[PDB]
């Protein structure tokens, strides 16, 4: 039973990773990269202004 539990736990992370692939595909497919570009610009501006 414990071994079955350990294997199912690994199956959980594997399935999470498999759905994470679709989640990543969503990020490119949705143009939230447009909503991400301004965030990238602001973060880089803050980083350069840090020092």
């Amino acid at each position: 039973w414990v071994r079955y539990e350990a294997s199912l736990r690994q199956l959980e992370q594997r399935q999470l990773a498999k759905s994470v692939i679709s989640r990543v595909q969503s990020e490119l497919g949705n143009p939230k990269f447009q909503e991400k570009v301004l965030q990238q610009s602001i973060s880089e501006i803050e980083q350069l202004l840090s020092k």
Binding site: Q10, E12, Q47, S50, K51
Partner: protein, 506 residues
């Protein structure tokens, strides 16, 4: 796993902080990569021998800080890596996640856990190449230990910091000799005694991962993983990983012994480590040296072994005794790596090819094997009383040396031959059966006192077991004292003689 989600959030928060404080504008771009070595431009201010973090995910050490093109080997597969990917300077010399928590965990090159048990705590992450203690911070081998298997061990001890070495052919099970040696960290370590503690840390330098699984299972079943940290480097793993692995074991040994407790180590097959150094040198740009192997083979081997020592009470009187294991082809004692290492290590136990199929599961060449400290740091049972038994071991080995085709000059030589041959058929401590500091001297003492020698040679294979069990359940006080009193006194010798009479009787 909601905990996996929390771990993902924490790691991505760390990554967001890293991105916000990238501080990487002129950091290097990998110009080219191959054979686990990546030629990378830029990185204009990278401190030498500092890990470099690469975009493809696999990191690697930076060895040759050549004029301009700073050479960083890839500590991982190349199918991911590619030229031009950004190279991020980790800013730190290669350091290994080290500390007492790694117990029972199999860690990758720098210390990445590989079993699948998650994080293991750290009591310090020190660089993989530490400077060993010199003269004053060093000390003698004043505290002995047990090799577990009798394994010609009372003959040639393995004491505090005794840098012993081995040798053997392919599939010689010298690895098994190591494993049994480790298992002895259950009759002292599994108690509560730090002075008896010798917290072993095996290594896995370039072995088939199936053999790694076999080692892990044999560690768990006999309950060894409670006291052995087995750093792993797969054959499928990349060359820089295998090369750096012995340095990682050195780091773990420092993290343990430097704390002040007497610890031990046993490097895996180090011939694979040498082959890895060969790959690292002959593949990056460095011209080859003697025996077609890289020139600094001795340098690397020493920097591994020389880390092990037995510091003085000034440093806590702790020690990191080491049992580096080297491999040859055809049991070749005469080789560049073998002979050069045998100069570095202070003890040798030669495992042959014939005897490996001829007469002994141990098959340790007693005459060939030697250790540079027999008196100082030997089992006080095996010397303080049985020192004559040690000289008798040397004498009987010399006796069996001449036992090939000479005639029967007298009866003295023949008697020595028969008794010593019964002794040799006896002394092989069966695999994964470490049980020693209780009747070690008994074999030679009974042979000279004529207790076992009167038994048939073949029958000894069970006669010894019966004698041991009789000492256990019948001579329990005397046997337990020999375990604990630390010496087999003349009175204890007489009581053991009585127990020997009882064993001969029943």
């Amino acid at each position: 796993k909601a905990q996996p989600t929390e771990v993902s959030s924490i790691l991505e928060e760390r990554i967001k902080g890293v991105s916000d404080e990238a501080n990487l504008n002129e950091t290097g771009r990998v110009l080219a990569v191959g054979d686990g070595i990546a030629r990378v431009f830029g990185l204009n201010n990278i401190q030498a021998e500092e890990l470099v973090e690469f975009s493809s995910g696999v990191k690697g050490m930076a060895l040759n800080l050549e004029p301009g093109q700073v050479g960083i080997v890839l500590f991982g597969s190349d199918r991911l890596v590619k030229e031009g990917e950004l190279v991020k300077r980790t800013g730190n010399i290669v350091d290994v996640p080290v500390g007492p928590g790694l117990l029972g965990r199999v860690v990758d090159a720098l210390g990445n856990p590989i079993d699948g048990k998650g994080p293991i705590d750290a009591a310090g992450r020190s660089r993989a190449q530490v400077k060993a203690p010199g003269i004053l911070p060093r000390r003698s081998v004043h505290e002995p230990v047990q090799t577990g298997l009798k394994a010609v061990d009372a003959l040639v001890p393995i004491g505090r910091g005794q840098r012993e070495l081995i040798i053997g052919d392919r599939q010689t099970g010298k690895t098994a000799v190591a494993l049994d040696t480790i298992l002895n960290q259950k009759r002292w370590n599994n108690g509560s005694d730090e002075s008896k503690k010798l917290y072993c840390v095996y290594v896995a330098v370039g072995q088939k991962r199936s053999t790694v699984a076999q080692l892990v299972q044999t560690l768990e079943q006999h309950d060894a993983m409670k006291y052995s940290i087995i750093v792993a480097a797969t054959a499928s793993e990349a060359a820089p990983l295998q090369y750096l692995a012995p340095f990682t074991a050195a780091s773990i040994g420092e993290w343990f012994r430097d704390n002040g407790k007497h610890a031990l180590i046993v490097y895996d097959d180090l011939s694979k480590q040498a082959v890895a150094y060969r790959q690292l040198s002959l593949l990056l740009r460095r011209p080859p040296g003697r025996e077609a192997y890289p020139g600094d083979v001795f340098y690397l081997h020493s920097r591994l072994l020389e880390r092990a020592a037995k510091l003085s009470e000034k440093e806590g009187s702790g020690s990191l005794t080491a049992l580096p294991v080297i491999e040859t082809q055809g049991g070749d004692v005469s080789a560049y790596i073998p002979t050069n290492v045998i100069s570095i290590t202070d003890g040798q136990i030669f495992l042959e090819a014939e005897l490996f199929y001829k007469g002994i599961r141990p098959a340790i060449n007693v005459g060939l094997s030697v250790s540079r400290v027999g008196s100082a740091a030997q089992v006080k049972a095996l010397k303080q009383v049985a020192g004559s038994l040690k000289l008798f071991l040397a004498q009987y080995r010399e006796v069996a040396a001449f036992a090939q085709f000479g005639s029967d000059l007298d009866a003295s030589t023949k008697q020595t031959l028969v008794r010593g041959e019964r002794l040799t058929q006896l002394l092989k401590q069966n695999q994964y059966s470490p049980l020693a500091t209780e009747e070690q001297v008994p074999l030679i003492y009974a042979g000279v006192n004529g207790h076992l020698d009167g038994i048939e040679l073949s029958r000894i294979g069970e006669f010894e077991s019966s004698f041991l069990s009789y000492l256990k359940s019948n001579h329990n006080e005397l046997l337990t004292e020999i375990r604990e009193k630390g010496e087999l006194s003349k009175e204890l010798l007489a009581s053991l003689k009585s127990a020997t009479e009882s064993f001969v009787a029943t």
